[PDB]
Design a binder for this molecule. Structure first.
Ligand SMILES: *[C@@H]1O[C@H](CO)[C@@H](O[C@@H]2O[C@H](CO)[C@@H](O)[C@H](O)[C@H]2NC(C)=O)[C@H](O)[C@H]1NC(C)=O
Ligand SMILES: *[C@@H]1O[C@H](CO)[C@@H](O)[C@H](O)[C@H]1NC(C)=O
Length: 497
């Protein structure tokens, strides 16, 4: 329906300017005819998920790369795609005028948007908050009588989460992560820095913390929200580092292992929220496979663990094979999930680069790498940030797919937003990743998946400058002649039957 209004801010590509009355949206997706394929193209030069269509022919004209689909080779089923409703995001969204707010939300969750179906919810404060707080700051309330939701939840997060779902065509799954416990449950009695829960698993500190989760879930239920899953702790490894600057709670693997086994596991199960799934790690992939060895080879722990959460920040220091691959090998029936699918940094680039194609490309390349190694879903970090990368009470380091310029009642959609869309929009929950055999070494990044209605979706990412002539063969249907233009991402969709 509405094309992208491009703006340049001096970087490799454009953002799409959206404001109170105008934002680029899609039409309902169409189920086109057998022999016909759909193409959604985004390019550094400035095309944004542009829809074209073509023929799948029964003869093969090319001499180039041949990506051959292999519907038989079957891998993981997709849980979904989303982002985090952090204090900072909630705060930027809420700073736009209501009409603008909806264009933003529709952008992510509506079928006119990119159809997100996951939302991560931090449990109380983290670095993307304007203040350090937990849901029970009153010291030595082991019973948690004073536990309650701040205005952050009742006025910012919960209202938007409702609106997100209202707007969403898919059913959306909520995931919660805690950053810190009340500081009185902690060994160092501070929201950050090195320090864990006091005593050890089974004890009153651990039982309380376990109960916190249930209270947290209880509270969101009163506001008519269910969670699909929680993570045992966000970045547990961080709470082990001397003078770590933001909200954290250290667990070593063994510590997490026992906390899950003795406390969180049972208490959750023993609650009305027993159906909520527990995900472990929720940390850097480099800590795998070890972390999984330690938690999952203990039966009493692993009976409680539905999957392993991972982060993207530190991936350059761990390849996928050695981490996610080896972990899947060892633990095939424990799904791997990316709960903090974020980056967009360096030492020398600022937090937010308005219209950087490069970060867009990192995102999609990361999602593909993920999918090729059995990962079932993704949660980007903040749904929205300001132009400074804020607000962050410690220090703004990350980008976000949407940037809110509060003074102008307008928001900007980064290349990233479209790089996630090339997936989030066309790979609903249930989709299964299938085989896709390249005929020769090449510079592209490609993944194939099968929509629950039996039809096909292939994302092709050209991270190089050169156009790469391309042929996708589907033995049930024929051949897609195409080119993958340098610095582009393409989603190809077709019926198979
Ligand atoms: C929100 O964005 C839209 C689109 O960029 C702005 O409307 C455009 O205004 C320019 C210049 O006045 C025209 O070239 C276009 O025809 C308009 N777009 C339309 C009508 O589709 C709009 O001004 C923005 N809202 C505010 C308050 O600035
Ligand atoms: C709950 O929290 C406050 C902190 O404002 C504390 O002083 C109060 O006594 C607490 N509990 C009860 C039973 O009122």
């Amino acid at each position: 329906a509405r094309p992208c209004i491009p703006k340049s801010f001096g970087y490799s590509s454009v953002v799409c300017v959206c404001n109170a009355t105008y934002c680029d949206s899609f039409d309902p997706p169409t189920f086109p005819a057998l022999g016909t394929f759909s193409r959604y193209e985004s390019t550094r030069s400035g095309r944004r998920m542009e829809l074209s269509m073509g023929p799948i022919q029964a003869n093969h004209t090319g001499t180039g790369l041949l990506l051959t689909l292999q519907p038989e080779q079957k891998f993981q089923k997709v849980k979904g795609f989303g982002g985090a409703m952090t204090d900072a995001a909630a705060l930027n969204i809420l700073a736009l005028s209501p009409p603008a707010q909806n264009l933003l939300l529709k952008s992510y969750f509506s079928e006119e948007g990119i159809g997100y179906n996951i939302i991560r919810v931090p449990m109380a404060s983290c670095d993307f908050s304007i203040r350090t707080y937990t849901y029970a700051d009153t010291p030595d309330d082991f019973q948690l009588h004073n536990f309650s939701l701040p205005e952050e939840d009742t006025k910012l997060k919960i209202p938007l989460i409702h609106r997100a779902l209202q707007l969403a065509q898919r059913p959306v799954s909520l995931l919660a992560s805690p950053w810190t416990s009340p500081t009185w449950l902690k060994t160092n009695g501070a929201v950050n820095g090195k320090g864990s829960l006091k005593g050890q698993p089974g004890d009153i500190y651990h039982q309380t913390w376990a109960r916190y989760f249930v209270k947290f879930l209880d509270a969101y239920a009163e506001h008519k929200l269910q969670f699909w899953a929680v993570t045992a702790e966000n970045e547990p490894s961080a709470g082990l580092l001397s003078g770590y600057p933001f909200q954290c709670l250290g667990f070593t693997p063994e510590h997490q292992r026992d906390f899950i086994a003795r406390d969180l596991g049972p208490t959750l199960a023993n609650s009305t929220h027993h159906n909520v799934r527990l995900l472990m790690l929720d940390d850097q992939r480099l800590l795998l496979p070890h972390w999984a060895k330690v938690v999952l080879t203990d039966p009493e722990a692993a009976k409680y663990v539905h999957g392993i959460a991972v982060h993207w920040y530190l991936d350059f220091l761990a390849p996928a094979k050695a981490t996610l691959g080896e972990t899947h090998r060892l633990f095939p029936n424990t799904m791997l999930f990316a709960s903090e699918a974020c980056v967009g940094s360096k030492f020398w680039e600022q937090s937010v680069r308005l219209g950087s194609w490069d970060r867009g490309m990192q995102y999609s390349h990361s999602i593909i790498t993920n999918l090729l190694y059995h990962v079932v879903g993704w949660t980007d970090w903040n749904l929205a940030l300001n132009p400074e990368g804020g607000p962050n009470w410690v220090r703004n380091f990350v980008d976000s797919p949407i940037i809110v310029d509060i003074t102008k009642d307008t928001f900007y959609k980064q290349p990233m937003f479209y790089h996630l869309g090339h997936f989030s929009k066309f790979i609903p929950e249930g989709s299964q990743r299938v085989g896709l055999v390249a005929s020769q070494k090449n510079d592209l990044d490609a993944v194939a998946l099968m929509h629950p209605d039996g039809s096909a979706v292939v994302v092709v990412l050209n991270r190089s400058s050169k156009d790469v002539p391309l042929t996708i063969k589907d033995p049930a249907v024929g051949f897609l002649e195409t080119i993958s233009p340098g610095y582009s991402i393409h989603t190809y969709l077709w019926h198979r039957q």
